[PDB]
Amino acid sequence: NPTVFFDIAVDGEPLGRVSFELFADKVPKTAENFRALSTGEKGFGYKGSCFHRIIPGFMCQGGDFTRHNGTGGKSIYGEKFEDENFILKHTGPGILSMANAGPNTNGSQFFICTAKTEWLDGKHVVFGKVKEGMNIVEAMERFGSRNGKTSKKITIADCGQLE
């Protein structure tokens, strides 16, 4: 399974690095999308994008690199792609899962759980987990709010694939 990293910044100041294991062995198409978006190798991707919705107690959501407002993003396969499978569940903090607009509408937006969110099981494709830097994700929560609006700009200052 490949590993990718995000270097997180808060209003342009470094916070730290989060790395993720991507479950290519169970969800290869979905893992590959996130991997390629993390490297930028298709000519577009996560670098420079923000976490537009942070709700403490639930999750941190980001991945809109096209409109930068929470409505955009695109996959490496087209605007949207189908739900690969729902094998993996939202079991607790650190789970990495796809945002969507309903069935079969995966793009680039994703979320990192900060708690168990079992009512999302079967609706969002889980495809990875935080490997290192969960402390960083925990630290991001204070910049969110009940409706998710952030009080500082939380950005992916850099991202890529690790050896």
Binding site: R53, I55, R67, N69, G70, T71, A101, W119, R146, N147, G148
Partner: protein, 169 residues
């Protein structure tokens, strides 16, 4: 200055946010941007009196219907929105009205029925059906387009008038 707590409810995608953003920000964005929840404040003049509107824009998500009760308790009047091209959203109106009635323990709750998206040519809910539903509730019915602004101020101001009449008693 009198404050009015308005809550905009209805099925997902009917245009609750588009209506609210038109009122607050005077523009329309043609994007899929589902709401979590948002609160807005706006001062207006209605029938010659300064009113302060506190507007809660809510998510239309059946999977979170239990989360509605808390804001139904606090809200003073409800804009109940359906889309004129979505017959399911028109049926869903009754679920919201029943929930408001049960949470607030009253048949007298200020409400306005709003049929949105009246700029679209292909209508599936006829005005006769909507008028008869509003009449059966004893509440006003207003047709709107958040896209063109048609009826938008009328919908919110009519709801304030319903609250104002309720408070007179």
């Amino acid at each position: 200055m009198t404050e009015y707590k308005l809550v905009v409810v209805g099925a997902g995608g009917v245009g609750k946010s588009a209506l609210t953003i038109q009122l607050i920000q005077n523009h329309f964005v043609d994007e899929y941007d589902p709401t979590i929840e948002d609160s807005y404040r706006k001062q207006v003049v209605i029938d010659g009196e300064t009113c302060l509107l506190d507007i809660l824009d809510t998510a239309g998500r059946e999977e979170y219907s239990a989360m509605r009760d808390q804001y139904m308790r606090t809200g003073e009047g409800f804009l109940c929105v359906f889309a004129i091209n979505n017959s399911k959203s028109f049926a869903d109106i009754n679920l919201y009205r029943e929930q408001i009635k049960r949470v607030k323990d009253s048949d007298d709750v200020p409400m306005v029925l709003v049929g949105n998206k009246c700029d679209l040519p292909t209508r599936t809910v006829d005005t006769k059906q909507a008028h008869e539903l509003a009449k059966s509730y004893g509440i006003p019915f207003i047709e709107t387009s958040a896209k063109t602004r048609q009826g938008v101020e009328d919908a919110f101001y009519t709801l304030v008038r319903e609250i104002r009449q309720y408070r007179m008693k």
